[PDB]
Structure formats: structure tokens, C-alpha cells
Ligand binder design. Structure first.
Ligand code: CYC
Ligand code: CYC
Ligand code: CYC
Ligand code: CYC
Ligand code: CYC
Ligand code: CYC
Ligand code: CYC
Ligand code: CYC
Ligand code: CYC
Ligand code: CYC
Ligand code: CYC
Lengths: 160, 204, 172, 162, 172, 162, 162, 162, 172
């Protein structure tokens, strides 16, 4: 939530909520209906937004689908559907909270040791995310392409 | 079994629903009718127009040609309507257009090709999709060809066409249905593991 | 669906006045060169099957990925559909240079076929290069005066290359 | 827009074939037509204002009741005469447009397609426009084959009216 | 596609119980005034062509840009289509005040015609003003007494002006 | 939803015309019907609970096997009786809804359209509902023309059942 | 032939069902209409000849040019007046036929369906018939609800004319 | 039978209208075409037998295997040469028929419509007929616009073949 | 659906040989007089509405039983259909004299309309007399020359009267 780290940034200074910050927590609530419907579209079209975008990963990086690889076969690119669905899940949780702390609680800081233990290069995964950003904004409106993609650019920078 | 009625749907505003106070001009669809006792060459043009309407131009292959249906039509054993039903129920149509689409998209494609209009709303596609599920694709096409809308516009002897694509004062009309609704959508394209990306740039 | 004459008529009606004199001299010169337009059109039309076969011949020599299995034009049915798509594009080019207006080419192909090739998974780049090569071969076939009186095809090479580039850019 | 080149392209497109010698025959014929028709359209453009006023005066002459009775459909007041002579000039401009286009397409798309319901809703008799077109086709002053096909277009408008 | 009675029936079925008594007294008063609703509907219906001609007569006196060349209702065909669009709107208003529900007017016109006028390039403002003027003239034609027994038509002027304002706002 | 005003609007819409005197004849007739039908629907609303219990008891009386044999379709247990009398009240409520609406539309859309396949899938005999509707049409206690058209709606439900 | 019983049978046939209470509501309404409409049609039958002559004289009064100009469409000669008053009596007879039939069906099948193209081909202004129908609906001399629905049929003919 | 006057009548019939100036433009163009085309067809009729033998010899020259291998599709025996030169004369006769008719209709109805399946069933290469038509269009010896449209018809046959 | 030229082509193909010389001289004379036919046809076409109105005008003066109540052309709708039937017959006559062959007139009207008029209860005699009077008025309108270069319309008068008599006899 945009509340709970504006709490944390006001806690370390030992201060109450400033009225300049208090408009930001006011305008989030009155625009909370605008973000839940664009998070409904990612909830509804979650199957289409991973299936063609996974082929955009393998078109641009076909090293993964090669034999002797990390994610090879009908059952291991199945695990890429069993892994990239969580990143498509968590961006919706980044939208409805208003900021990046559901991203930051689940899938950021351990991924340097996660994918090393998995043996997958992270930037191979990250270019699948940046190609997914190019196809997520095909569904979004011209207004909502920035703000729903604003939580995408935190995830691309977290992998890289 | 009590016949389940077609699910009700709301109508949309379309050019085909209003009277057109128009003088015939170059944008009017050429009407192919069997009523005028067509010459042997005119039968081939009517048959060609019916294949173009139901299959699309890219599906007019020698292997898709229904030679028995064409001889029945040329002999007057079947109507142009029955010929359209025979084309829409043919093996090459069902293989290429039914098996590569969902019931909703197949219903939209058949409404556009057989009734010569667009679908009013998504609820009309849902209402026709249950007919396809219960009666199969054949019983759906028969119900579409038995609609008052088909009979009032084309009768038994006229080949279907895209009704009122262009307004008389516009050089640009609506998109031709064959370009609007290609053989399959993005969903079946992703299943085929096809085009999109198939090159690795360069080595450096 | 517009001619040259209907284009001037629609513009003069949107102006609301009669046709001005300079437009009538332009249309008189158009009526003088409309047959000239036509000679290229008929010698373009007579070699159409050779044009599309040579265009696909150079294209599939150039991009062998389309012929390769898994390619978009690999399957025999799909390859026949590929040649059909090319022949359709050439035919509507010949129609547009018949009527002397690009509005027929726009109306019949352009607005839908880009979305069609996106939805089909058809690579727009290869068919764009094929329409470009077909247009280059078409002007090359038109410009050679074999058994034809000496004239000037300048502006009509201009117009035909315009129509082909409009088709290739609307394909993308 | 029924013009010869447009309908030739429509024939070749609906047949699904390339252009043949038939369309080229249509073309040398169309150029033969336009080679006099463009100059005849320019001549009608020159004589247009006097033809419009003469047609309006002939219409007031044959139907004198329209100048007399009060009614917004009739040209008794001045605004009726402005709008009236405006649609006289409309008819003449559509005649010149069909002379340039080489077919009855422009009048069929700009005049004919709704004229019956308009005259039904507005209490306009089409015989007024028939009288005006008859005066125009009598007084246009052209000669020869251009005059015959000009009279053809005007007679087509008359037959479309009544 | 709903009546007044079918509206109460659908609401009572969504509640799942029988119809309450006060709704039945309301429907009894509706059955008493339903003829009152519709004699006027009949005097609205009989003058419909005069209503649409006077409405277009005042509208094209008011906005001469539509009659001007290049205007949206300039062409004879387009002007006939304009009068057809207005007559259709008036007819569905008469249907909705016949059945006593706005759902028929919604169903038959409203959801599509706004997008239709956007896609056509039709100015929604002029047709909105025309439907407003037509509705004002319709209530003005309905409210006068010329040989009819006097009655209080206050809620039906209310309802008819509601239907006309719903049409004018859904047009926009 | 076959109600008279709705179907009059459907006739006038499918014909493409305005309303005529035919629909106004339909209307003065419909108001004549509703002028007694609304009060009759209120009277049925008053007597509804006792009519439901009497219909359920008559159904248990004529078909005593349904109270005896074990089976989830039969009302041997208590939940069968709750659900059973619930669909008795469903039938009576649809009768009152058609009395208010003035046509067989509500029962045709809420009951009739799927009742055959439901009784086929659930092993429910429709004769039970026929017996219950016969008891209701015998015991509703109305009089006059309201009683005749109430019996008309109930007989329509009976004919739609079997 | 849009008459209420015919269109009720058409509704019940196109739906594929039996008759319901809706058609009986239509019927008691239609009998209520006919119970005055038949006597009103008899009264119009009585006053018919004087109404026809008065309508013809009012039409000659409002449009005096039709009596003056030579033309076979105009009633300048005597045969124009015979044929003219014949179609006045035609209009009045169709009004009485719709009064008996209870709907606009007879005028819609005998008059309206081709009247526009006939007036287009024959140079007949429909405003003449509008003036005659206005004189008839002013001078028919009925009273009450019969008079209102008679005026309804005549106004329907007027709206179908222009 | 795609000939210009026939297709003009088909356009005017499918539109449901009378003939306009468009068809008369088509007609003066068609007469302009026929005014040289008939004499060119007579000249081809004169040179026909030598053209047929020269085309057959050029076809045997470019494809010498057809004279050598045993096979009933090949013209190794004499009956193959009789039938072969018979279909050479067939192609030339269809060229003259399209020259007279003024359109590609006769070849489209007599040759093109089934030629693909016939060459598929009979193991005839269409390139033989392409070589023969190329020899004919090289050696017909006409001049001017008649020669260009003759080459147009022959090139149309070539494009219809392959 | 046949021309003059396609008629000679079909006859020469049924013979199986080339076209003989005398048929080519006949077709050359046909090409010389085809405009003659065209000129006559155009003055027939321009007065078509006057022709059908005068034909029905004389016919309903001649047979007042059709206008009489209970008559076949009595009803306004039926009378409009009557004028439509006559105008259709005149249009196909103009088509047949355009193409120079009666096969279009046969194809489009003749084989069915006799049975149609039997099944409808239409008297074939009145419409036969009407087509005869319309044809007489059509030749009478064609044969007079006003502001036209002198030409022999006489060869055509034979052919046009042939087409009209074929129509009137196929109607019966
Ligand atoms: C070859 C140049 C390129 C190519 C062509 C290709 N196209 C298709 C399939 C379709 N093409 C169209 C295009 C049109 N239809 C029209 O009606 C018009 C204008 C009149 C156009 C431009 C359509 C609708 C389809 C789908 C339906 C069909 O039968 O053809 C294919 C086949 C795809 C398939 O799965 O069948 C091909 C191969 N594609 C390439 O690879 C080249 C780049
Ligand atoms: C263009 C790339 C080359 C070129 C052409 C050119 N043509 C003409 C003139 C004529 N061309 C024709 C051709 C036809 N007329 C027909 O009816 C038909 C059948 C469909 C054909 C093939 C004719 C007849 C003319 C004019 C009349 C005549 O020749 O009798 C010109 C000059 C005249 C003009 O502008 O029309 C030219 C230049 N010339 C080149 O040098 C180009 C390479
Ligand atoms: C004088 C010629 C006769 C006459 C004319 C008259 N017409 C109107 C009203 C309209 N006229 C038209 C006609 C056209 N509009 C077009 O765009 C074209 C083709 C380009 C034509 C032929 C239309 C659409 C109207 C309605 C628009 C409007 O109301 O302004 C009037 C004004 C009467 C009116 O309120 O409706 C007049 C006076 N009337 C005569 O008395 C003369 C014999
Ligand atoms: C006059 C008030 C305004 C106006 C009207 C106008 N409308 C059109 C064209 C269309 N209007 C419709 C609207 C409907 N169709 C329906 O079926 C229904 C409900 C049952 C409605 C409300 C449609 C579909 C069209 C396009 C197809 C057609 O024939 O009519 C035009 C003409 C546009 C054209 O290019 O033909 C006009 C002029 N426009 C105005 O200028 C006024 C503001
Ligand atoms: C061949 C594949 C295919 C499917 C899957 C399909 C589903 C489908 N279910 C529908 C309705 C329905 N489907 C349901 C089912 C349910 N609703 C519930 O309450 C439960 C959760 C669930 C029972 C398991 C219901 C109740 C409707 C009726 C909605 C209505 O009629 O308003 C409709 C609307 C049209 C109609 O039934 O008559 C479609 C198209 N149609 C098809 O052609
Ligand atoms: C379908 C053919 C038909 C019509 C047309 C019809 C109309 C009609 N309107 C009536 C009453 C009435 N109608 C009105 C209407 C109005 N009074 C006003 O001052 C308002 C402005 C206006 C409504 C906007 C009123 C006030 C009455 C009084 C009687 C009543 O309540 O019915 C009555 C009652 C009985 C009678 O008058 O004999 C009839 C007959 N009846 C029919 O059978
Ligand atoms: C509003 C219109 C409407 C009707 C009519 C209706 C009937 C209906 N009755 C049902 C079951 C039932 N119907 C009965 C009724 C009976 N069995 C007997 O033995 C008695 C003779 C009779 C008592 C009246 C019973 C006991 C059940 C529960 C049996 C079951 O599991 O399916 C079910 C299946 C739902 C379920 O299983 O609970 C439906 C849909 N539903 C509706 O929505
Ligand atoms: C039963 C329904 C019915 C109607 C309405 C009808 C009208 C009708 N009126 C006609 C002519 C006519 N209509 C009129 C009428 C008039 N002209 C005037 O100047 C007066 C203002 C007005 C007098 C009422 C006249 C004078 C004719 C003869 C003109 C003619 O040759 O066509 C004609 C053409 C028949 C003919 O030429 O004799 C028809 C069909 N026919 C029908 O069967
Ligand atoms: C009027 C238009 C028309 C055409 C074009 C036509 C072609 C035609 N050529 C045929 C055979 C043939 N076609 C050829 C021709 C050739 N083979 C060669 O080696 C040479 C390269 C070439 C000489 C031109 C020969 C030799 C036959 C006989 C082979 C057979 O049994 O089928 C046949 C099968 C009939 C038969 O078996 O006798 C047809 C239908 N028929 C027509 O009616
Ligand atoms: C393209 C060729 C073609 C022809 C020839 C044709 C004739 C034709 N004339 C018809 C009716 C008619 N035809 C006539 C004509 C006449 N009856 C008379 O009393 C006079 C003798 C004669 C006037 C010359 C009439 C009055 C009807 C109406 C019958 C009716 O509607 O009941 C009908 C019945 C359907 C309908 O008109 O709307 C057809 C099919 N239809 C065609 O498609
Ligand atoms: C499609 C538009 C169009 C028309 C209408 C047209 C007509 C037309 N008729 C012509 C000639 C002619 N037309 C006629 C016709 C006749 N003379 C009589 O005395 C007879 C009564 C009548 C036939 C029934 C004659 C006699 C000529 C003499 C010149 C010639 O033979 O063409 C000519 C020769 C060239 C010219 O006049 O400048 C033209 C243009 N040409 C066109 O492009």
C-alpha cells in the first residue's frame, strides 16, 4: 500500500503525516476505482498475456528452448508458464496497492540466489518481462499505459 | 424434448436496419441471382461468387471445389440457398474455418458471410454458440438460412453479399468481412507455434 | 471508390462551386494522357502471372525461412494462399492505375490487410519486400518499348511506383 | 457513383479477374466522350447564371400560383426565391458534374437518391423542377453531340423526377 | 423490452416473493391512467409528420451550416436520411410512452446510435437540439384541448419530457 | 414475455410502422382486463399460504407412494417437503405474476421453457404438479370473470405440463 | 390487412402457440371498439355524397389553379371532375372500410401502398388529397369517441400522404 | 461470355435501371474496336493454316522429347500429330473468335474453364501450348493497334495457362 | 444472353469451322449500322416514362373494366404494380435492341411471365394490347427526327417492331 511506506518514511523521521503527503493518500482512494478495473483486465486476460508473450521470449532469446538448457521441453517451458504467471500476478498486486511493496515482499531480493540455484540467466527472464511490457500496453488505454507500466519498470530494473 | 429458444439479445444501430434512399452506383454489391435463367457462363460466375462469399478468395483451391453440388445447382435440383448451405456444411469449410475457431468466432464468421451483416453484440455470438453446441455446425447453418432475415434479403435464388458496406456520400465504407474476420484469430495462431519470431539477428 | 473525374467532382462539390478552369485544363491533359496511362496498364496486365511467379521466385530465393518447415509459407496450401495474396495485390494495383486513383487500392486492400497479417502471424516484412520487388519488376516490364511507338511514360512511372509504395507501406 | 471506369473496375473485381480488352474499349470510348464533354461543361459553366435566372422565371411563369399564395414551401416571399434559385443552381451544377464525370453517378448520389421523400415531406411539386430542367435543356445553346448527351442527362433527371 | 407490468413482475421475481399490495395499488392507478397516458399518445401520433417537418424546419433555420455545402445534412440523400433518423427517434418515443417504460427506447436506439453518430461524423449536438425541439413541440401539441374532456395530464407531460430528455442525452 | 402491450410494440416494430388504432383497441381491452385482474391477484396473494398447504396435502393424498418410498426425488423426508411446497409456492407465484402482467409471459419465461427437461432429469412426474394446479383452480375461491381467466392461466400451465 | 384479430392470429401463429388471454383481451377491446364504430360507419355512409361534394368544392377553393390551367392531370375539363370526385369517394369509402374493419388495413392495402409512385407518375399533388381529407375530418359531424377515432384514421391517411 | 455489350446489359439489369450514357460510351468504344478488329480477324483467317503448322513445328523444335518417347499423350505417332495440330487450330480459332466478339469471353468459355483439369488428367504440359501461342503471337504478322490487342488476347491465354 | 457477335460465334462454333466471309461482311454492315441502332435506341430510351404513361393512359381509357372496382388493375397497389410491369417490359425491349438480339428479351421475361399472368389472374389480353400500343408509340416516337442528322431508321423499325411483337405474343 501507498499508506504503509509513507508510514515508514514518516516513522524514521519520528513525525506525523505531512499535509503534502496527505493529499497523496487522499487522491489514491478517490482514484482507487480507476486502478481496480485495469487490474481486472490483467486478471481476466492473464492467459493471453503470457502465452503469446512467451513466444516473444523465445523469438528474441532462443537459447532457452535449445537442448541442454535450463527450460527445455514440453514440461520445462511449462514451468515458465508456472513461473511467469506469478510476475503477471504480482504486477496486479502492485497496481491495487499503489506502489511496489507487494513486488518487494515476494519476488525481488532473493532472485540473484534463486536463479543462480536454478541456473537460469536473469536477463533472459528480464527480456521476457520487457517484451511482456510491450504487449501489456497493447491492451491498456493511452492514459493507463504509463501508470500501469510504471510498476513494470520497477520489475525490469529489479532483474537488471 | 422442449425446443430451447434462441437466447434473447439487444439489437445495435446498423446501416442495414434503416431504409436507404439511394440511387444505384459503382459501390453497390453486384447481385448474383438464378431467377434470370443464367447462361452457362453466368452459372460459373454465380458459383464463383458463392465460393468467394463463403470460403474467401484464398480458399478457392481445386481441392475444395464441390463438383457434385455445382452439377446439382446447374441442373436446378437445388436452390442457391441450398448451395450456400452445402458450401457452409462442406468438409473443407469445417476443417479450415470451424476446427480453427471457437464457437463464438465461428458464429460471428457465419453471420457475416451468410447474413451479410455484422453481429449486433457479444450476446448474439453467445446466443448462436449454444445452437452450435446443441445441434452441431450443420444445424446452426440450417437455422441461419431459415431465418426471416435471410429469406427477406436474399430469398432462395440470390447469393449473399455484404449488405450496405458503403454509404452513398463516402468514398470509404466498412472493412470487407474477409479482411475483418480472417480464417483464425490470435488464439489459434499462438497454438500453431507459428510466425511471430523465427530469426536470430546477427553474430557480431 | 473514386475516379480522377469523380475526385475532382467531389472536391468541387465540397467547395460548393463549379469546377475552375485550371482543373479543367488539368483534366484535359489527363484525358490526353489517360490512354498513355493505359498502355503501361495493358502491358503491365499481360505479364501478370510472370510477374507474381518471378516475384515469389526471388522472394523465396531471398528468404528461405519461409520455405523452411515451420515457416509461414511452408505448407503447400499456405504457399498457394501466399501466391493468391500477391496476385490480389497486383490486381488491385492494376485497378488503381486503371481508374487513376489510389482510393480503390485503399478501399479494397489496405485498411484491413495489415491487421489480417498481424492476426494470422504473417510476417509483414516479407510481403512488403515482395510487393516492392514485384513493383520494381512491373515498372521494369512496363518501361521497355518493344514494338511500341515512341512516347513519354515519365509521370506514369511516378504514379505506378507511388501505388506500389503505398501498397508496400500499408502492408508493413 | 456510376461512372464508366469505376463500373469497369467493379466488373473486373466482382468477376475476380484482371482487366481485359473490354475495359480498354470502355476507356477509348470514355476518352472520346470526354474530349468534347469537358469543353461543353466549361460552356455550361459560362452560361450558368443566366440559365438559372431564366429557369426560375419560366417556373414562375408556368406556375404563377407559387408567387401568390402564402406558404413557406412556395416562393412568395424573398427567402423562398433565394432558396428556390439555389436549388435551380444545384440542379445545373449536378448537370455539369455529370458532364465532367461522364456518367449519371453524381446526380444519382447527390440529387436522385432522396428527392422523392424530400418532395413528399416538404410539399414541393417535382413538376416545378421538370419545368426548370425543360427550360434549361431548351436554352443551354450547345450544338451537336455534346448537346445531345447534355439533353440525355437532363432527360434522365426528368425521368428520375416523374 | 419491458412493460410497466413486466417491470413490476421482474422486480418481484428478483425479490423472489409475491407482489406487495402498494405496488398493486400503484398498478391499479396505472391501469386507471393508462388510457390517460395513451389518448395523448394518440394525439401525439396523429401529428407526427408535422412534428418532424417543423422540427427540421426550425433546426435548419437555426443551424444553416448543415444545409450549407460540405455540411453533414447538405446532400439530398443525406437530408432524407436525416429526416428518417428524426422520424425513427419520434416513433420509438411513441413506443416507449405506449408501453410506459423507457427500456424499449433504450433497447432500440440509445446504446448504439451515439457511436453511430460518432463514426459517421454526424454532429450529435444538432440532432440533440432537434430532438429537444421536437419534444417541446410534441408536449405543446399534446397539452392543448380542442374538443377533449379536461383532465390533469401533469405526470404524463412529466413522463414524455423524461423520455425526450433521455433520448436527447443518449444522443449527445 | 408475451404480454399484450409488449407484443403490440413488437408487431408495430416488425412492421416498421407507427402505432395505429389496433394497438389502442388492445390497450382499452388490456385496461379492462387489469381493472379486475389486479384485485384478483391481491386476493390470491391473501389466500396463498393456505392454498399452498392444501395443494401439497392433496398431492400427498392422491399420490401416497411419494410419502412412503425412500428417494431424494420423493418427499418422504422433510427436505423433500420443504423443497416440494417451495415449488408449489413457485407455481402459485407465477400464476399471480401472470395475473398482474396480463399474459402467459411470466410463466412461459420462468416455468414452462425448461420444465420438461427438468422433470426428465430429476424423475419428477408432472402429474403431481397437474394435481396441485387442479386443487388450486378448484379452491382459489374467486368468482366471475376474474375466476374464469385465473382458471385459464392454470389450465394453460396444465396443458404446458402434459 | 392489419386488423386486430388477424394480427393476433399472426402473433400466435408465428410464436407457434395456442391463443392466450392476451388475444381475448384484444377481442373484448375490439368488440368495445366495433360497438360504436359500426354505427359511426353507417352515419358516414348516410352523409357520404354531400361530404364528397363539399370536399371537392373545398379543394377547388383552396387550389383554384387546378380549375383553370389546361392539363389532363388538372380538373379543368369535366372528365377531370368526374375522375377527381371519384377518387374523393374512393378516399371516403376507404375511411368507412377501416371504420368497419377496426384497423388501418383496408386503406393500407387499397390506397397507401402505391399512392406515392402514382402521384409521382401522374403529376398529382398529394396536398389536394390532404385538403380534402382535412375538410372531411372537419365536416363529418360525428361526436365523441367515434369522432376521435374517425379523425385518427383520416389523420393516418394524411400522414401517409405527406 | 464476357463481351462488352453483354456485360453492359448485365450491369444495367443487376442495377435494375435503364441504359445510361455509360453504356453508350461502352458502345462507341466497342464499335471503334471492331472497326479494325474484324479485318484483323479476317487476316488471321487467311494466314491460319501456315501459322498452325509453324506453331506445331516450333513446339516440336523446343520440346524434341515429345516426338521421340512412346506415349499416347506425346505426339510420337501420327494420330498424336493430327490431334495435336487440331488443338493448335482450336487455340487459333478461339483467338479469332475473341477478336470478333471483342472480349475474352469465347476463349474463357471454350478453352480456359476446364483446361487445367484436362492437362492434369491427360499428362499434357501447358508449356507446349505456351510455346505455340508465343510462336503465333510472334508470327501473326499484323501491325498497329490490331496487333497489340491480338497480342493481348494471346497473352491472356498464356497467363490463363500458366 | 447473346449479342449479335456472340450469336455468330456460337453458330460458327456449332459448325465447328471458322467464320465464313459473308457473315463477316454482314457483321461489318452491322458494325456500320450498329450506331444507327444506338441512335434510335437512345431516342427511344429518353422518352420512356412518357411512353409508359401514355400507354397506360390509352389502355385504361380503352378498357375501363381494369379501373372498375373488382378489376385486376383497380387497387392503387395493383395499379402501381401494373405500371411497373409495363416499364419492365419496355426496359427489356430497349436492352434487346441495344444488344441486337431477342435472346435477352426471351431470357429475362418471356418464358415465365405468361405463366405468372395466368397464375395471378392477370388478363393477358390487356397487357398484350398495352405492349402493342406502347410499341406503336415507341416506333412513332423513334421515327420522327428532331435536330438529328438524317439516317435510315427503317431497318431498325423492322427489328423494333419484331421485338415488340415477340413480347406481345409471348405475353398473350
Ligand atoms: C506471401 C506474399 C506472404 C504471405 C501470404 C499469406 N496470406 C495468407 C492468408 C490470408 N491472406 C489474406 C489476405 C487478403 N484477403 C483478401 O481478401 C485481400 C484483399 C482483397 C487480402 C490482401 C486473408 C484474409 C488470409 C486468411 C484466409 C485465407 O484463405 O487465405 C497465408 C496463409 C495463412 C494460413 O494459415 O492459411 C499466407 C501464407 N504470407 C507469407 O508468408 C508471405 C510473407
Ligand atoms: C509507355 C511505357 C510507352 C509508350 C506508350 C505510348 N502509347 C501511345 C499511344 C497509344 N497507345 C495505344 C494503344 C492501344 N490503344 C488501344 O485501343 C489498345 C488496345 C487496348 C492499345 C494497345 C494507342 C492506340 C495509342 C494512341 C492512338 C493510336 O496509337 O492510334 C503513346 C503516344 C500517344 C498517346 O499519348 O496516346 C505513347 C508514348 N511510349 C513510350 O515511349 C513508353 C516506353
Ligand atoms: C424554386 C426552384 C422552387 C422551390 C424550391 C424550394 N425548395 C426548398 C427546400 C429544399 N430544397 C431542397 C433541394 C435540394 N437540396 C439539395 O441539396 C439538392 C441537390 C444539391 C436539392 C435539389 C432541400 C433539401 C430543401 C429542404 C432544406 C430547407 O428547408 O432549406 C425551399 C424552401 C422551402 C422549405 O422550407 O423547406 C424552396 C422555396 N419552391 C418553389 O416554390 C419553386 C417552384
Ligand atoms: C439529423 C437529425 C441529424 C443527422 C442525421 C443523419 N443520420 C444519418 C445516417 C445514419 N443514421 C443512422 C441512425 C439509426 N439507424 C437506426 O437503425 C436507428 C434506430 C432504429 C438509428 C437512430 C444510421 C445507422 C446511419 C447510417 C446508415 C444510413 O442509411 O442511414 C445521416 C447520413 C450520413 C450519410 O453519410 O449517409 C444523417 C445526415 N445528421 C445530421 O446532420 C443531423 C445532426
Ligand atoms: C460447447 C461449449 C459451450 C459452453 C460451455 C456454453 C455456455 C453457455 N452457458 C450459457 C448460459 C448458462 N450457463 C449456466 C450455468 C451455470 N450457471 C450457474 O449458475 C452455475 C454456476 C452454472 C451451472 C454449472 C446458466 C444458469 C445459464 C443461463 C443464463 C441465462 O439463461 O440467463 C450461455 C448463454 C446462452 C444459453 O444458454 O442458452 C452459453 C453460451 N455454450 C456453449 O456452446
Ligand atoms: C384508441 C381510440 C380511443 C381514444 C382516442 C379514446 C380516448 C378517450 N379519452 C378519454 C378520456 C380522457 N382523455 C383525456 C386526455 C387529456 N385531457 C387533458 O386535458 C390532457 C391535455 C390530455 C392528456 C395529455 C382526459 C383528461 C380524459 C378524461 C376521461 C378519462 O379519464 O378517461 C376517453 C373516455 C371515454 C370517452 O371519452 O368516451 C376516451 C374515449 N378512447 C378510445 O377508445
Ligand atoms: C419458479 C419456477 C420453478 C420450478 C417449478 C422449479 C422446480 C424444481 N424442483 C426441483 C426439485 C424438487 N421438486 C420437488 C417436488 C415434489 N416432489 C414430490 O415428491 C412432490 C410431489 C413435489 C412437491 C411439490 C422436490 C421434492 C425436489 C427436490 C428433489 C431434488 O433433488 O432434485 C428442482 C431442482 C433443484 C433442486 O434439486 O433443488 C427445480 C429446478 N424450480 C423453479 O425455479
Ligand atoms: C381506391 C383508392 C384509389 C385512389 C386514390 C386512386 C387514384 C387515381 N387517380 C388517378 C387519376 C386522377 N386523379 C385525379 C384527381 C384530382 N385531380 C385534381 O385536379 C383534383 C385536385 C383531384 C380531384 C380529387 C384526376 C383528375 C385524375 C385523372 C387524371 C389522369 O389521367 O391520370 C389514377 C390513374 C387512373 C386514371 O388515369 O384514370 C389513379 C390510380 N385510384 C384508386 O384506385
Ligand atoms: C476448343 C478448345 C479445346 C482444346 C484446347 C482441347 C484439348 C484436348 N486435347 C486433348 C488431347 C491431346 N492433346 C494433344 C496435344 C499435344 N500433345 C503433344 O505432344 C503436343 C505438344 C501437343 C500438340 C498441340 C494430343 C497429342 C492429344 C491426344 C492425347 C490424348 O489421348 O488424350 C483432349 C482429350 C480428347 C482426346 O483424348 O482426344 C482435349 C479435350 N479440346 C478442346 O475442345
Ligand atoms: C423481369 C420480368 C418480370 C415480369 C414481367 C414480372 C411480372 C409480375 N407482375 C406481377 C403482378 C402484376 N402485374 C400486373 C400488370 C397487369 N395486370 C393488369 O391488370 C394489366 C393487364 C397489366 C398492366 C399492363 C398487375 C396489376 C399485378 C398485380 C397483381 C397483384 O398484386 O395482385 C407479379 C407478382 C408479384 C408482384 O408484382 O409484386 C410478377 C412477378 N415480374 C418480373 O420480375
Ligand atoms: C451515347 C451518347 C451519344 C449519342 C446520343 C450519339 C449520337 C450520334 N448520332 C450520330 C449520327 C446519326 N444519328 C442518326 C439517327 C437518326 N437519324 C434519323 O433521321 C433517324 C430517325 C434516326 C435513327 C432512328 C443519323 C441518321 C446519324 C447520321 C450520322 C451517323 O450515321 O452516325 C452521331 C455521329 C457523330 C456526331 O453526331 O457528332 C452521334 C454523335 N453519339 C454519342 O456519343
Amino acid at each position: 500500500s501507498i499508506v504503509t511506506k509513507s508510514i515508514v518514511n514518516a516513522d524514521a523521521e519520528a513525525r506525523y503525516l505531512s499535509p503534502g503527503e496527505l493529499d497523496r493518500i487522499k487522491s489514491f482512494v478517490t482514484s482507487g476505482e480507476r486502478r481496480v478495473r485495469i487490474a481486472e483486465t490483467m486478471t481476466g486476460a492473464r492467459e493471453r498475456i503470457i502465452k503469446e508473450a512467451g513466444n516473444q521470449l523465445f523469438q528474441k532469446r532462443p537459447d532457452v528452448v535449445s537442448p541442454g538448457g535450463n527450460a527445455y521441453g514440453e514440461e520445462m517451458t511449462a514451468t515458465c508458464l508456472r513461473d511467469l504467471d506469478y510476475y503477471l500476478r504480482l504486477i496486479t498486486y502492485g497496481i491495487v496497492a499503489g506502489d511496489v511493496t507487494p513486488i518487494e515482499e515476494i519476488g525481488v531480493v532473493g532472485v540473484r540466489e534463486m536463479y543462480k540455484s536454478l541456473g537460469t540467466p536473469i536477463e533472459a527472464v528480464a527480456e521476457g518481462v520487457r517484451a511482456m511490457k510491450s504487449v501489456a500496453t497493447s491492451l491498456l488505454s493511452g492514459e493507463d499505459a504509463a501508470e500501469a507500466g510504471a510498476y513494470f519498470d520497477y520489475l525490469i530494473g529489479a532483474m537488471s | 424434448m422442449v425446443p430451447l429458444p434462441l437466447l434473447s439479445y439487444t439489437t445495435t444501430s446498423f446501416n442495414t436496419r434503416v431504409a436507404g434512399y439511394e440511387v444505384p452506383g459503382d459501390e453497390q454489391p453486384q447481385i448474383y441471382t438464378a431467377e434470370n435463367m443464367p447462361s452457362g457462363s453466368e452459372w460459373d460466375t454465380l458459383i464463383w461468387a458463392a465460393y468467394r462469399q463463403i470460403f474467401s478468395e484464398h480458399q478457392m483451391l481445386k481441392s475444395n471445389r464441390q463438383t457434385f453440388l455445382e452439377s446439382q445447382l446447374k441442373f436446378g435440383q437445388i436452390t442457391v440457398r441450398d448451395f450456400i448451405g452445402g458450401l457452409a456444411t462442406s468438409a473443407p469449410f469445417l476443417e479450415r474455418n470451424y476446427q480453427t475457431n471457437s464457437n463464438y468466432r465461428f458464429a460471428e464468421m457465419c453471420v457475416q458471410r451468410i447474413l451479410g451483416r455484422d453481429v449486433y453484440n457479444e450476446r448474439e455470438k453467445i446466443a448462436w454458440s449454444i445452437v452450435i453446441a446443441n445441434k452441431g455446425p450443420k444445424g446452426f447453418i440450417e437455422e441461419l438460412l431459415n431465418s426471416d432475415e435471410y429469406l427477406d434479403n436474399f430469398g432462395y435464388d440470390t447469393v449473399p453479399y455484404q449488405r450496405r458496406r458503403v454509404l452513398p456520400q463516402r468514398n470509404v465504407g466498412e472493412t470487407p468481412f474477409n479482411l475483418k474476420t480472417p480464417r483464425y484469430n490470435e488464439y489459434h495462431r499462438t497454438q500453431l507455434g507459428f510466425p511471430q519470431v523465427i530469426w536470430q539477428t546477427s553474430v557480431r | 471508390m473514386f475516379d480522377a473525374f469523380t475526385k475532382v467532382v467531389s472536391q468541387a462539390d465540397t467547395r460548393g462551386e463549379m469546377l475552375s478552369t485550371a482543373q479543367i485544363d488539368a483534366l484535359s491533359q489527363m484525358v490526353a494522357e489517360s490512354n498513355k496511362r493505359l498502355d503501361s496498364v495493358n502491358r503491365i496486365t499481360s505479364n501478370a502471372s510472370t510477374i507474381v511467379s518471378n516475384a515469389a521466385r526471388s522472394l523465396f530465393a531471398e528468404q528461405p525461412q519461409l520455405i523452411a518447415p515451420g515457416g509461414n509459407a511452408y505448407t503447400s496450401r499456405r504457399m498457394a494462399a501466399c501466391l493468391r495474396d500477391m496476385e490480389i495485390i497486383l490486381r488491385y494495383v492494376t485497378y488503381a492505375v486503371f481508374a487513376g486513383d489510389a482510393s480503390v487500392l485503399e478501399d479494397r486492400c489496405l485498411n484491413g490487410l495489415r491487421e489480417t497479417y498481424l492476426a494470422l502471424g504473417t510476417p509483414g516484412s516479407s510481403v512488403a519486400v515482395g510487393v516492392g520487388k514485384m513493383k520494381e519488376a512491373a515498372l521494369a516490364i512496363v518501361n521497355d518499348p518493344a514494338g511500341i511507338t515512341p512516347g513519354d511514360c515519365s509521370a506514369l512511372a511516378s504514379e505506378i511506383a507511388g501505388y506500389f509504395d503505398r501498397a508496400a507501406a500499408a502492408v508493413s | 457513383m456510376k461512372t464508366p471506369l469505376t463500373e469497369a473496375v467493379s466488373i473486373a473485381d466482382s468477376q475476380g479477374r484482371f482487366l481485359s480488352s473490354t475495359e480498354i474499349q470502355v476507356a477509348f470510348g470514355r476518352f472520346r466522350q470526354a474530349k468534347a464533354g469537358l469543353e461543353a461543361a466549361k460552356a455550361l459553366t459560362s452560361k450558368a447564371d443566366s440559365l438559372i435566372s431564366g429557369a426560375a422565371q419560366a417556373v414562375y411563369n408556368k406556375f404563377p400560383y407559387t408567387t401568390q399564395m402564402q406558404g413557406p414551401n412556395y416562393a412568395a416571399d424573398q427567402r423562398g426565391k433565394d432558396k428556390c434559385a439555389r436549388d435551380i443552381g444545384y440542379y445545373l451544377r449536378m448537370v455539369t458534374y455529370c458532364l465532367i464525370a461522364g456518367g449519371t453517378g453524381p446526380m444519382d448520389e447527390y440529387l436522385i437518391a432522396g428527392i422523392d421523400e424530400i418532395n413528399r415531406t416538404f410539399e414541393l411539386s417535382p413538376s416545378w423542377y421538370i419545368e426548370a430542367l425543360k427550360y434549361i435543356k431548351a436554352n443551354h445553346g450547345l450544338s451537336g453531340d455534346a448537346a445531345v448527351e447534355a439533353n440525355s442527362y437532363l432527360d434522365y433527371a426528368i425521368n428520375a423526377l416523374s
